Design a protein around this ligand. Sequence first.
Ligand SMILES: C[C@@H](O)CNC(=S)N[C@H]1C[C@H]2CC[C@@H]1C2
Length: 282
Amino acid sequence: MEMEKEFEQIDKSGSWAAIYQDIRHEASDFPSRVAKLPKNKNRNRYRDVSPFDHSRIKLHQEDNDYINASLIKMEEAQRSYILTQGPLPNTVGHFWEMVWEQKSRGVVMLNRVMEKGSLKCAQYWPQKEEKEMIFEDTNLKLTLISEDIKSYYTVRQLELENLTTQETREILHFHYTTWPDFGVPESPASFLNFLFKVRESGSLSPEHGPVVVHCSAGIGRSGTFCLADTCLLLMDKRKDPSSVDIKKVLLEMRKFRMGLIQTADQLRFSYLAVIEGAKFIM
Ligand SMILES: C[C@@H](O)CNC(=S)N[C@H]1C[C@H]2CC[C@@H]1C2
């Protein structure tokens, strides 16, 4: 079926939970043996969210190459994304090591450091120009260059220096600051405006390594971001945009990381975002 009318048909019939449970039943199951090794327990935020072995990102280190991060490679859309958990106190250096080694231009953050009165990820970037951060375990330096605070999101320019080679690179930090502590946004308008800002920066384009996207677990809000982007790109590329099947695209993405889209409300929000986004594109 088309999307917008499939949408109203699920609303009128109130069957979002049944649609979402079908997706969960059909999703891929692949091994995640490296994630479950005992030496990696303090590298995982949640025991039930792990990268598959076949698609995990490897650090270029011979001691321990493990990080909780997956490469989602979308062949028809010609987009790649790295989805990862919010960094932990003992993985902030690994996180920036990955950004460096994978040649990413942009980092997309969809959570606040504290939500619901608890810590959802480490404070992994500097908040003042004159107070830079040094990660001694991976030999990197990170400096805040500039910061632009808007009503729904903040953009930061950062300098990442590899202290071993003295090479430097400019990294863009796109921080969506207004996702509600509970539920999903009422309108997708500000999320779509944010996605377009990331696109306009060049961070999603083939002349750079894959964008790094995270929330707390790296599967819920993060899944919404890449699902909406890929679906909109396919609607632009194909002769018949109504052929784009968001449930099929989601199942393809779940071949590369488990659990993408965590609730039926996130599924409905993803439909809403693609539907509204397709009207603005034209
Ligand atoms: C006519 C409908 O079945 C549309 N099919 C779609 S959108 N397939 C997608 C799933 C993954 C593999 C191919 C694309 C990305």
